[PDB]
Design a protein around this motif. Structure first.
Motif, mmCIF file in Angstrom:
data_model
loop_
_atom_site.group_PDB
_atom_site.id
_atom_site.type_symbol
_atom_site.label_atom_id
_atom_site.label_comp_id
_atom_site.label_asym_id
_atom_site.label_seq_id
_atom_site.Cartn_x
_atom_site.Cartn_y
_atom_site.Cartn_z
ATOM 1 N N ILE A 263 9.199 7.594 -0.862
ATOM 2 C CA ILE A 263 9.201 9.061 -0.943
ATOM 3 C C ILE A 263 8.522 9.647 0.684
ATOM 4 O O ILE A 263 8.659 9.372 1.804
ATOM 5 C CB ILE A 263 7.409 9.748 -1.802
ATOM 6 C CG1 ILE A 263 8.065 9.137 -3.243
ATOM 7 C CG2 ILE A 263 7.129 10.949 -1.840
ATOM 8 C CD1 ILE A 263 6.561 8.936 -3.765
ATOM 9 N N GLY B 33 0.914 -1.397 -0.398
ATOM 10 C CA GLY B 33 -0.107 0.501 0.161
ATOM 11 C C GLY B 33 0.489 0.972 -0.014
ATOM 12 O O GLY B 33 0.222 1.650 -0.645
ATOM 13 N N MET C 291 -1.628 -1.440 -8.664
ATOM 14 C CA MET C 291 -1.361 -2.205 -7.691
ATOM 15 C C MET C 291 -2.110 -3.197 -6.624
ATOM 16 O O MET C 291 -3.251 -3.633 -6.999
ATOM 17 C CB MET C 291 -2.689 -0.680 -6.685
ATOM 18 C CG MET C 291 -1.849 0.350 -6.919
ATOM 19 S SD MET C 291 -0.516 0.958 -5.801
ATOM 20 C CE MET C 291 -0.096 1.821 -4.697
ATOM 21 N N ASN D 241 4.619 1.072 -0.494
ATOM 22 C CA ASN D 241 5.801 0.402 -0.863
ATOM 23 C C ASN D 241 6.401 0.875 0.390
ATOM 24 O O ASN D 241 7.311 1.374 -0.428
ATOM 25 C CB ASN D 241 6.551 1.003 -2.468
ATOM 26 C CG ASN D 241 7.240 0.063 -3.145
ATOM 27 O OD1 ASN D 241 7.282 -0.619 -4.041
ATOM 28 N ND2 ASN D 241 8.592 0.347 -2.068
ATOM 29 N N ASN E 50 -4.797 3.384 -5.835
ATOM 30 C CA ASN E 50 -5.185 4.484 -6.499
ATOM 31 C C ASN E 50 -5.069 4.684 -8.304
ATOM 32 O O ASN E 50 -6.216 4.613 -9.143
ATOM 33 C CB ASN E 50 -4.705 5.674 -6.091
ATOM 34 C CG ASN E 50 -5.366 6.746 -4.646
ATOM 35 O OD1 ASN E 50 -6.335 5.396 -3.377
ATOM 36 N ND2 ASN E 50 -6.763 7.268 -4.964
ATOM 37 N N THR F 41 -6.894 16.435 1.590
ATOM 38 C CA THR F 41 -7.411 15.130 1.864
ATOM 39 C C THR F 41 -6.494 14.380 3.419
ATOM 40 O O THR F 41 -7.418 13.771 4.140
ATOM 41 C CB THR F 41 -6.750 14.070 0.451
ATOM 42 O OG1 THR F 41 -7.494 14.248 -0.454
ATOM 43 C CG2 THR F 41 -7.291 12.588 0.845
ATOM 44 N N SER G 71 -12.369 4.791 1.226
ATOM 45 C CA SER G 71 -11.078 5.418 1.778
ATOM 46 C C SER G 71 -12.143 5.780 3.767
ATOM 47 O O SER G 71 -11.488 5.739 4.891
ATOM 48 C CB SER G 71 -10.106 6.179 1.819
ATOM 49 O OG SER G 71 -10.844 6.886 0.256
HETATM 50 C C1 LIG Z 1 -7.652 7.842 -0.725
HETATM 51 C C2 LIG Z 1 -7.029 8.746 1.002
HETATM 52 O O1 LIG Z 1 -8.025 9.076 1.514
HETATM 53 C C3 LIG Z 1 -6.017 8.585 1.678
HETATM 54 C C4 LIG Z 1 -4.966 7.450 0.980
HETATM 55 O O2 LIG Z 1 -4.687 8.330 0.125
HETATM 56 S S1 LIG Z 1 -4.812 6.271 1.270
HETATM 57 C C5 LIG Z 1 -3.887 5.479 -0.039
HETATM 58 C C6 LIG Z 1 -2.494 6.248 -0.350
HETATM 59 N N1 LIG Z 1 -1.116 6.027 0.011
HETATM 60 C C7 LIG Z 1 0.260 6.217 -1.012
HETATM 61 O O3 LIG Z 1 0.847 5.491 -0.572
HETATM 62 C C8 LIG Z 1 -0.086 6.745 -1.956
HETATM 63 C C9 LIG Z 1 1.145 6.604 -2.515
HETATM 64 N N2 LIG Z 1 2.237 5.838 -3.075
HETATM 65 C C10 LIG Z 1 3.520 5.563 -3.159
HETATM 66 O O4 LIG Z 1 4.156 6.259 -2.247
HETATM 67 C C11 LIG Z 1 3.624 4.285 -3.842
HETATM 68 O O5 LIG Z 1 4.849 3.730 -2.392
HETATM 69 C C12 LIG Z 1 4.426 4.010 -4.854
HETATM 70 C C13 LIG Z 1 4.076 3.754 -5.381
HETATM 71 C C14 LIG Z 1 4.710 5.314 -5.550
HETATM 72 C C15 LIG Z 1 5.952 3.813 -4.743
HETATM 73 O O6 LIG Z 1 6.736 3.033 -6.186
HETATM 74 P P1 LIG Z 1 7.866 3.785 -6.154
HETATM 75 O O7 LIG Z 1 8.894 2.898 -5.745
HETATM 76 O O8 LIG Z 1 8.173 4.854 -5.620
HETATM 77 O O9 LIG Z 1 7.381 4.357 -7.760
HETATM 78 P P2 LIG Z 1 7.410 5.574 -8.576
HETATM 79 O O10 LIG Z 1 8.422 5.875 -9.791
HETATM 80 O O11 LIG Z 1 6.427 6.694 -7.858
HETATM 81 O O12 LIG Z 1 5.776 4.975 -9.765
HETATM 82 C C16 LIG Z 1 5.389 5.242 -10.143
HETATM 83 C C17 LIG Z 1 5.010 5.622 -11.979
HETATM 84 O O13 LIG Z 1 4.844 6.731 -12.713
HETATM 85 C C18 LIG Z 1 5.268 6.982 -13.363
HETATM 86 N N3 LIG Z 1 4.837 8.915 -14.093
HETATM 87 C C19 LIG Z 1 3.362 8.766 -15.008
HETATM 88 N N4 LIG Z 1 4.062 9.877 -15.865
HETATM 89 C C20 LIG Z 1 5.329 10.718 -15.678
HETATM 90 C C21 LIG Z 1 5.931 11.918 -15.383
HETATM 91 N N5 LIG Z 1 5.774 12.243 -15.627
HETATM 92 N N6 LIG Z 1 7.408 12.340 -15.196
HETATM 93 C C22 LIG Z 1 7.883 10.916 -14.500
HETATM 94 N N7 LIG Z 1 7.234 9.928 -13.833
HETATM 95 C C23 LIG Z 1 5.753 9.439 -14.614
HETATM 96 C C24 LIG Z 1 6.156 6.800 -13.113
HETATM 97 O O14 LIG Z 1 7.709 6.541 -14.965
HETATM 98 C C25 LIG Z 1 6.583 5.697 -12.352
HETATM 99 O O15 LIG Z 1 7.234 4.489 -12.997
HETATM 100 P P3 LIG Z 1 8.354 3.970 -13.030
HETATM 101 O O16 LIG Z 1 9.410 3.945 -12.033
HETATM 102 O O17 LIG Z 1 8.317 2.172 -12.587
HETATM 103 O O18 LIG Z 1 8.639 4.232 -14.227
#
Ligand SMILES: CC(=O)CC(=O)SCCNC(=O)CCNC(=O)[C@H](O)C(C)(C)COP(=O)(O)OP(=O)(O)OC[C@H]1O[C@@H](n2cnc3c(N)ncnc32)[C@H](O)[C@@H]1OP(=O)(O)O
Ligand SMILES: CC(=O)CC(=O)SCCNC(=O)CCNC(=O)[C@H](O)C(C)(C)COP(=O)(O)OP(=O)(O)OC[C@H]1O[C@@H](n2cnc3c(N)ncnc32)[C@H](O)[C@@H]1OP(=O)(O)O
Lengths: 283, 283
Positions: free
Chosen positions: B225, A220, B147, A222, B142, B238, B118
């Motif tokens: 992050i 969720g 995911m 990462n 999301n 949010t 959520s």
């Molecule tokens: C809903 C509610 O009320 C409350 C909540 O939100 S609960 C749920 C929220 N929780 C969260 O953690 C949300 C955020 N998620 C995260 O941080 C996750 O840990 C994570 C998926 C980001 C971890 O992954 P990561 O190792 O950081 O990979 P990340 O690079 O961020 O992945 C995103 C992709 O978007 C892509 N992307 C798309 N457009 C892009 C652009 N213009 N520029 C750069 N990258 C872009 C990236 O290339 C990337 O893929 P790759 O790295 O494989 O090429």
């Protein structure tokens, strides 16, 4: 400039620091209470150097070139040779005082005295030395060789000069340094640990299984390791203590330890270091 | 078995779910209020399919083979075709009630009704439908396509049968499912969000800079992050809302929102979605 680093303590941490200064070129004067502890400190530095030689890192000529720089003593006037001493021996408050008091008797007014910790008030320490403005808190992370960060913790008295110097020293050692005003839990522990605690609260409440709580956070958000598995790595007695410091120092039940974390600790289920904690492990 | 999935809602989430069921072989009956919203839902599924074709994933013959399975209507008797309907339209409580009430009028006693969320109490919802034991909460994450997890949230009334079915459904869709008794914040948000909050508390207190707080957690706990940068991604409005739910539902100042998070929100500095939050961004 800081060409020669002082280090009191040759345990896990002090080997760390020393290496981290040596593999860079700074002269370490390491100090402990026996010759046995000192060379055991050197064996580990070497042993860890030989892992790096193995995974195509460094060279056979740096395993050598570093160690030359490590002057590992058992007398404490040796530390006059130094530009800065870093205490890295103990989280026991009253022993820490003594050590720093003794270090403070040896070196000159303008030398900087640091102290590694995760929990001890840097302001409370600095105040026991002659030059409080020359005191600063450090906090390295646990496999010091590879972890690229230090919390630099200013006591209320640390000077701007004292800060910038040790700021630069850290930057040389190859780590990004965070800067933090002395506060319970500094930065990392302050936000990380109450989260681990909230996982114990959730598990205590019957809301979900430990393995699924942990996976939730892994997938969720990462995160590499789920907080419970992580709690088992840190030590649940180490966790409780941090939370107790949080609760005690802020005097706020916001930081109430989780009741299940208390219970596991009372039962002796402390994690990986006892084979049983949130999860069961081998031995 | 569940061969045909119902979906009310064709926004970001509903496209997600639908795709996730289609790229597997399940028949989706998608439903919204206009034909415009429905096809905009299909355009996105296709568009996202064409990214996967591009990075050597799937095939040109699955972009096709999936869409066949998506029956995208604007009438709501269409959902009788289904074994289960998943509401995915709204976090507005009173609108949610209506929708589920209407969905509950159409399909038969033994069909399962789910609701993505959520923040909304699953028990409070389930209780508005005819068969409460046939209600279960879902919460996808999301970017649903990639995911690999769902929180499956049992209202007080959800049955064991209702659970196992939707447990299996999730497992087919290719995600690991967490199971959670209905509780404010379920699992992920429950522990993640109060941590984000603690970062705002730390920054509010003057203890360290935002970039260094964030790096501390990145390097120190190998988080992808830092929480502040993350808060800017989620939305500070949010975040505040989640914390308000935590504080309000538990009636415990343990979950006090950070005061700086309140201030930023009042000022309109909501993050990436407004260009300014903890950090400043372009536009
Ligand atoms: C809903 C509610 O009320 C409350 C909540 O939100 S609960 C749920 C929220 N929780 C969260 O953690 C949300 C955020 N998620 C995260 O941080 C996750 O840990 C994570 C998926 C980001 C971890 O992954 P990561 O190792 O950081 O990979 P990340 O690079 O961020 O992945 C995103 C992709 O978007 C892509 N992307 C798309 N457009 C892009 C652009 N213009 N520029 C750069 N990258 C872009 C990236 O290339 C990337 O893929 P790759 O790295 O494989 O090429
Ligand atoms: C002191 C206090 O009071 C309170 C505190 O503790 S504050 C500081 C504690 N905070 C922490 O976060 C501690 C834990 N740290 C983490 O979880 C870090 O995020 C992290 C370094 C583990 C992240 O890294 P990661 O992506 O999970 O990598 P990880 O695989 O765990 O790295 C450990 C290495 O040990 C190695 N290893 C050594 N012996 C091994 C064995 N017998 N079996 C398997 N692996 C072994 C692994 O191979 C691994 O290296 P590679 O993966 O590169 O081969």
């Amino acid at each position: 400039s800081i060409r020669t680093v002082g280090i009191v303590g040759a345990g896990t941490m002090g080997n760390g620091i020393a290496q981290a200064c040596a593999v860079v070129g700074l002269n370490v004067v390491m100090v402990d209470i026996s010759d046995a502890a000192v060379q055991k400190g050197v064996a580990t530095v070497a042993s860890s150097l030989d892992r790096l030689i193995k995974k195509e890192k460094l060279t056979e000529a740096d395993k050598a070139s570093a160690l030359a720089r490590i002057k590992g003593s058992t007398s404490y006037d040796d530390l006059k040779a130094t530009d800065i001493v870093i205490e890295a021996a103990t989280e026991n408050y009253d022993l820490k005082v003594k050590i720093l008091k003794q270090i403070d008797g040896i070196v000159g007014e303008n030398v900087i005295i640091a102290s590694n910790t995760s929990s001890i008030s840097i302001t409370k320490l600095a105040a026991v030395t002659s030059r409080a403005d020359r005191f600063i808190g450090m906090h390295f992370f646990n496999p010091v060789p590879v972890m690229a960060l230090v919390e630099l913790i200013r006591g209320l008295q640390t000077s701007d000069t004292t800060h910038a110097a040790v700021e630069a020293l850290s930057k040389q050692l190859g780590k990004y340094p965070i800067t933090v005003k002395n506060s319970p839990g500094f930065v990392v522990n302050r936000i990380l640990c109450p989260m681990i605690n909230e996982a114990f609260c959730v598990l205590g409440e019957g809301l979900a299984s430990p393995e699924e709580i942990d996976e939730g956070m892994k997938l969720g958000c990462n995160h590499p390791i789920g907080p419970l598995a992580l709690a088992d790595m840190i030590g649940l007695d180490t966790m409780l203590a941090v939370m107790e410091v949080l609760y005690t120092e802020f005097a706020d039940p916001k930081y109430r330890p989780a009741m299940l974390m208390r219970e596991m600790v009372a039962a002796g289920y402390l994690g990986r270091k006892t084979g049983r904690g949130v999860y069961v492990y081998s031995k």
